[PDB]
Amino acid sequence: MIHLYDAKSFAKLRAAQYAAFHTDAPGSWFDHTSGVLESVEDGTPVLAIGVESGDAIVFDKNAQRIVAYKEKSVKAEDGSVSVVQVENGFMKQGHRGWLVDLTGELVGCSPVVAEFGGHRYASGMVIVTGKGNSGKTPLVHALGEALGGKDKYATVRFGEPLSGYNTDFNVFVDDIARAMLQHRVIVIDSLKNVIISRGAFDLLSDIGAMAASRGCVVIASLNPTSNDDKIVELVKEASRSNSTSLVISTDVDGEWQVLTRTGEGLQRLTHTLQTSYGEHSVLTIHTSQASGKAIQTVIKNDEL
Amino acid sequence: MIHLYDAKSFAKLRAAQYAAFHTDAPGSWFDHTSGVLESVEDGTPVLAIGVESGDAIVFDKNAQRIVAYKEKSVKAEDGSVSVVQVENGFMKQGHRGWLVDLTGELVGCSPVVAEFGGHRYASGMVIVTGKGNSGKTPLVHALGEALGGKDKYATVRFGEPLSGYNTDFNVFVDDIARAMLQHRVIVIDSLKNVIISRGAFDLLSDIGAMAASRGCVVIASLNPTSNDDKIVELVKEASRSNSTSLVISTDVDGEWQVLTRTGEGLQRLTHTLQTSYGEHSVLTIHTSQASGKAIQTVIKNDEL
Amino acid sequence: MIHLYDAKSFAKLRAAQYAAFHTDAPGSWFDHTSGVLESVEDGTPVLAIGVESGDAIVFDKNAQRIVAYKEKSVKAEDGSVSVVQVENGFMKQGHRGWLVDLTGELVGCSPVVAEFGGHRYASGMVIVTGKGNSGKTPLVHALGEALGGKDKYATVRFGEPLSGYNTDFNVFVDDIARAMLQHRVIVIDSLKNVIISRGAFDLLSDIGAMAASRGCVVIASLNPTSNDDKIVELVKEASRSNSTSLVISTDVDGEWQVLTRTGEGLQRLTHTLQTSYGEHSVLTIHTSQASGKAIQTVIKNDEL
Amino acid sequence: MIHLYDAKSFAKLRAAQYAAFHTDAPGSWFDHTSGVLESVEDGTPVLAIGVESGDAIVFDKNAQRIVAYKEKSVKAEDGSVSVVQVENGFMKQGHRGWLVDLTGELVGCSPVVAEFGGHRYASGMVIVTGKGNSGKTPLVHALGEALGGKDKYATVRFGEPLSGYNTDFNVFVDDIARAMLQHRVIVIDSLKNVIISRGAFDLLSDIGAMAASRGCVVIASLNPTSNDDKIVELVKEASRSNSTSLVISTDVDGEWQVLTRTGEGLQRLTHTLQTSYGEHSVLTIHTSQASGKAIQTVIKNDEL
Amino acid sequence: MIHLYDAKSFAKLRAAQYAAFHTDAPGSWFDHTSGVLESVEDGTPVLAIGVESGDAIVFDKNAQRIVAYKEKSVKAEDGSVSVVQVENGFMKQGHRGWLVDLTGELVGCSPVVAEFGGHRYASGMVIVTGKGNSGKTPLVHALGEALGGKDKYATVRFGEPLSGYNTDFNVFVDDIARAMLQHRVIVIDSLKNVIISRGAFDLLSDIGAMAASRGCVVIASLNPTSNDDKIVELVKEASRSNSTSLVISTDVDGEWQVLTRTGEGLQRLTHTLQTSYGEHSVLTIHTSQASGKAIQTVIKNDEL
Amino acid sequence: MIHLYDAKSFAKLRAAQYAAFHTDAPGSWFDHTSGVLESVEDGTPVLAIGVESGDAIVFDKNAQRIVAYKEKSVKAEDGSVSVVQVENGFMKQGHRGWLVDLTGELVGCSPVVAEFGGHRYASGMVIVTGKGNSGKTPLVHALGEALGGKDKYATVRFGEPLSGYNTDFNVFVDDIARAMLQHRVIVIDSLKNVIISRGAFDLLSDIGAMAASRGCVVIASLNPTSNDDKIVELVKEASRSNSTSLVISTDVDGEWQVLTRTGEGLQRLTHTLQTSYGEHSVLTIHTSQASGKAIQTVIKNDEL
């Protein structure tokens, strides 16, 4: 909805967003939204996501698709009205994204999803990319495990010429919706095939906001390597504008840079990561600040 | 509609447009149009804005969507006829924009929306953009608070990978329409995702006139940073031709340049702004002229 | 229709075309076509113009839209047949342009529309463009007042982020049609937003011929400023091929060059204009020649 | 249809094509096809041409459109079958071009349309183009008059911002079809607006074959001047591949080069033309050989 | 269908493909397939070729179009099922190409179509192209006569601005289909207008296999001369990948190079041709080896 | 489906993937999946593959198309639901790929398909490409025979102007589906014509995963040779991202480099092959390693 502010309320909003990242208990936001989702009326539409054609499919709190749901409106605070209607498995009325309010007046946050090795990590979308020899697949799994902490992480596999990999986009959005509805830490191996159809465009522009709203983190690998400025710029734009955080390789093998948006209008943070391989390519991230706009685009050049 | 002029009536118009900006009491035009809107028959269509597909949705004076409205024509002064009809939630007949006359013979103005720190600010669309380290989000909010003055400003959020952010274009135009119907100072955080569908194109070409006609100001952030001459030029065109005013960052951190179109055929004005950060990234614009066409394009180069 | 010629009849045509610009009394053609339009049967379709979609709308002699008109054919001189039919507000059968014969055998002219400061001006489409500090909006209004002479000029406003400006293309063509049906001197402020849909393309290729046939002049502002060779070349093509005349700014502030097509196969004329500003940006054109094809393209370079 | 040959019959075919240009009486072919067209059953479809949409319209021998014609087939020599069917004014079955046989076994000719100033001119399509100061419009009319000889020439006007000019493509194809059905010498002023829709593409690829089959000549002006390699190459291709002859200006004002395809597999001929202006821009071509492929493309460079 | 191989059966295949070109009696494959076609049930579909839209038309063994044919399946050797159905003149079910097995287990051949002047020529598609003064039209006809030998060659004419030339793509595919069903040596004059619609694309990718399967040769002229890397590369690809053989002009007038693919996985052969002109441009090819991949692309450079 | 992991279960997966290539008995996975397919209920859909349009066709365990199959769902482990439905020959509900579970929790593998000359080869999609004189057709057939070992390899022929070659994309996918359903070693000759329609794009992004899941190897020839960065880059992307393995030619004639993806997140291996020709172009691969990301793109440069 729209929000109204004066100096006082805006100052309070910024203090709260700052806290959502810096001081809140890691993963508390996810716990809170999990509570909101489970308290919802059974059969109630909670999430809509775009399939390949640009049409949207809808899920309930248990990640089951809702095929038919007769028109039902809800008047918001600002006086606006939200309407949801599902027919023959497709959203007839409504919008893409969360169909129920998880945030409230608290918008524009990057809820801390976890703390690891002395650093806090934001929820939302994290894109892992870069050129060079440092492997991305091993990195997303190590990050997924590290941020999962006590919890297991969920893995969504898509578009790789390996066994058991789904290559159908519509099955992919189904997997993603189920993952965000049920887990705090999600790994997506290969955004490459989405990088273009309407659904693909919708996903890139929607996923970060969906995850951040839920308080879950989606770690997605994206390879730039494709000297075709048409696609390469799309990679830089996705990394620049649709990612809540960015994890990119450097000149030194095994070393990565983490760039994190800490909230609406807040400063981006950066820290480095050292890693090493053990048996069968299992990667481990070793354990034992503010970056400017210019520095940010400097890292973006790396992918050219 | 169309207007006829001879030397005398043209001179009066220019004198009137000149006063609408330079001498009228700040915000007086918004108050005047609020009165025109509230005098409209209940349920009467007053605003039509395009959704993603290119179709248009219609609202009444209370920002409520009209789903059905049987054909109804009106003959204007120049003998032209306006016809409005709404079926199944979409305009079957009519045009995008204000569906009632808010201006009359007084057209081509940039009504003063507010006065702050010794400067008059124009209603209409203001694009906040540029390259460098100066933050746009903190700036749009400080501007919103400064121009709101005694009134709260309205914030429309869209397309950011942060908690509670809407990413559905159709919800966005709904928020925008409601905001212009009810508030004088509006902040849109991130036009980035509009910059392309029919609705997006309609928005860019319509918002400035809609706001200027209402007497409200829409302060929208736009980031150029995207070395892709296809989009970067679309940003320069939007900053050049779709904005009533432009606020762009300079070589000096915290410093901004304001460029204002003061009316139809009138000169553009320019002034600088110094700013500083307080706690939690809350920005403050410090308190205590004519610019040629060439100087204008010089500022436009900054975005490359 | 098609016309047949031998050397004698061809020479006669050229002599008449030459006269239609050089010696006919200024504005006489407009008066003549006004008489033809008024002698038409009531309810008779006289003008069809394309809307955004590419479909066309129809008007009668009083600039009122015709919504229903059953099939009706008319056999011309060359034996050809013209058929007009209107159904549900749109032309079902017919063509875009004048639906009645305003010219007869006298085609290929640039009928003198007015005389001012010692120079004859041609009816048709006049594009006011160029780069630099000289302002186009003040110029088009000054030209409109000067060529109006004893008569008021009509102003069509479109696509500018100023108050009361329509931004809907279909309302725009309705405004243009009404203008050409009722006035000799017409100003269009901002052809920018048309420069692309089927209707926009239709307007650019049709308006020049429609105005010239009527004997009215349409003075339209068009800004090249947009370093995107895709659009900048479209601007040069409109100025070169869809304009009866061109008014472009020069190296000296306040000075403009007028380039006029005097008739089919005839030479282009050129003269200069000096201007100055008075109060409230009201511009005045001071009072007190054959140019070749190469000199013409040279001027076209100015827009790059 | 398809034709079968052995050395003897091929040699005879080439001798006959050579004669169709070099020794046949100028204009005899047109006279012969005129005879074939007039002997056709009344109401019989003789010509189909594509309108803007790509659909085709059909005419009878008197240039009147056939709106309904029930399926009717004809078995050719090679055993193939030709079918023509018209419904609601559009060809349901058939092909674009002549619907009746005018040539016979004699195909691949450039029938001499006229002789003037000691040179024979081919029927088919002649494109007049080039850069520089030599005027094209005056040239097509002078050529039209010269080749008309004792007969008047027909003029098709399209796409110019001058009075009485049709700018509707469908009216244009109607004018052209009528012209080819009724006259040996045809002038088309401005192919510019066709240079893109389906009908436009169909016209460029069909007109030369239609005219050559009829034995009439279509003199079309085409301006290259448009530094946009997308369109400029289209101009060179139209001049290179869709023109039976080419008339292009040179370095010397008033002088032109004529390049003529003399038949299938035969050599291209070239000759120069000197011209001068009299009153009101009426051009006169003064009165009192084989060119190679390489030389041909050298002339094509002129348009860049 | 699909074929299975082990070292032995693969060796036999290669020996068989090798003989199909090197030792079989010239034209014996065409005779063999004529026999297969004539043994087909009357009215049975034998060939489907794509028209402009992408749809396909079907012919029987006598080159007559089939308009209606109720579904009829056939199980092949590999267990695959072929189904054919024709409704309202268009294939409702089936595939493009030969609808009956003409080859069997003997696939991947370039059957010798004829022997002339001491050289064996392959059936399939032969593209005659190149730059320079050597004429293609005279060459395709001389080749047609030379390879026809005791038989007349068939000539399919398309897209030239000459008398009696068809310019309708659908008539063209009809002529081609008939020609391949009835003659061994076919000449297509001007593939230029195909070089793009679905039908055009289908033709380029299908004709070579269709001819090679039949045992007939299609000799098609193609002109590169069109400095537009978009089309020029389409010509090099067609010459490289869609042609069974290539005949290209050299630096010396009258001299040509012949490049022949001799079979699947077999080496390409090359030989030169000297030619001279007789009367009326009738060309004569004078009478009285292996080439690597790199040499091949070297010849391909000639077209730039 | 989606899978959850902790450090322990992740390590187990990597160990299994590693083994699936390095130590499992060659071809054992294919045998295992053959057993899964045969234990399926008769009439059960097991594979869906996209046709040209983008629609998909379905096959049962015996490679026979299923035309009608009423809705039928299956709930998986992650709680997800799979639904298959076939109507009028096309999938109404389902996804492309394997419609039954061949892998289970064991995903992300490159199952060893065979061992030859001391090297293990991975199942999945293998692209044979490169520039230079080394021939691809002889190589793919030699690789097919070598990896077939005791078994015959299957050959799918497509898009070559040689006898008996199918050129219809829909027949091609039918051939591929049948091949993967029935054989461990498959050769596709000429992926060239797919390199673009929806089905072609579907095949490129799906075949690798389909083959790997089955444990069969698809060896496909692909020629880069086509200096058109639009296609040449598509060739590099297919080799880089849609290939399980890559076989590319080098600077030395007859020598090839094999680059193998050994499993998800595992290292790529590389070895060289020497070859020689025998009679009739029958190629023989002579008998008697970790490569980095950078070394990989280096090899990719070879195709420019």
Ligand SMILES: Nc1ncnc2c1ncn2[C@@H]1O[C@H](COP(=O)(O)CP(=O)(O)OP(=O)(O)O)[C@@H](O)[C@H]1O
């Ligand atoms: N033990 C080890 N030592 C060094 N590198 C290793 C390794 N085990 C795995 N790797 C690296 O892991 C990397 C990633 O594997 P891949 O499946 O190629 C995903 P990626 O390369 O990160 O992204 P991509 O598939 O989009 O190119 C490879 O570069 C591989 O070399």
Ligand SMILES: Nc1ncnc2c1ncn2[C@@H]1O[C@H](COP(=O)(O)CP(=O)(O)OP(=O)(O)O)[C@@H](O)[C@H]1O
């Ligand atoms: N205390 C502080 N001192 C200096 N800069 C601060 C600051 N607090 C916030 N900022 C700046 O606020 C800026 C804007 O926040 P962001 O959310 O990135 C919007 P933006 O960068 O202006 O536009 P964008 O999101 O389209 O790129 C950041 O660049 C950050 O550096």
Ligand SMILES: Nc1ncnc2c1ncn2[C@@H]1O[C@H](COP(=O)(O)CP(=O)(O)OP(=O)(O)O)[C@@H](O)[C@H]1O
């Ligand atoms: N008193 C004055 N002295 C000098 N210039 C004046 C002036 N009053 C107005 N102008 C000029 O009037 C010009 C035109 O006004 P604008 O609204 O910018 C239309 P334009 O610039 O002609 O075309 P545009 O809006 O497409 O760029 C401005 O450039 C302004 O400098």
Ligand SMILES: Nc1ncnc2c1ncn2[C@@H]1O[C@H](COP(=O)(O)CP(=O)(O)OP(=O)(O)O)[C@@H](O)[C@H]1O
């Ligand atoms: N008396 C004369 N002396 C020299 N040139 C003359 C002339 N009379 C007419 N012309 C030339 O006639 C030419 C053609 O007139 P136009 O209407 O511009 C057709 P064009 O220029 O040939 O093609 P175009 O309209 O596509 O550019 C102009 O260049 C004009 O200068």
Ligand SMILES: Nc1ncnc2c1ncn2[C@@H]1O[C@H](COP(=O)(O)CP(=O)(O)OP(=O)(O)O)[C@@H](O)[C@H]1O
């Ligand atoms: N007696 C002769 N001596 C030399 N050349 C001759 C000739 N008779 C004909 N020619 C050549 O025959 C050639 C071919 O005729 P055209 O109809 O132009 C087909 P092309 O030029 O080979 O291909 P194209 O039409 O696609 O450009 C011409 O270039 C002409 O020079």
Ligand SMILES: Nc1ncnc2c1ncn2[C@@H]1O[C@H](COP(=O)(O)CP(=O)(O)OP(=O)(O)O)[C@@H](O)[C@H]1O
């Ligand atoms: N005995 C032999 N000695 C050397 N090379 C041979 C040979 N027999 C066949 N070849 C080579 O086999 C190669 C491949 O045959 P082609 O049909 O051209 C398929 P390709 O070249 O691999 O891919 P392509 O058709 O996409 O270009 C040819 O380049 C030919 O030189």
Ligand SMILES: [Mn+2]
């Ligand atoms: Mn990876």
Ligand SMILES: [Mn+2]
């Ligand atoms: Mn921002």
Ligand SMILES: [Mn+2]
């Ligand atoms: Mn202006």
Ligand SMILES: [Mn+2]
């Ligand atoms: Mn002209």
Ligand SMILES: [Mn+2]
């Ligand atoms: Mn030719």
Ligand SMILES: [Mn+2]
């Ligand atoms: Mn090959």
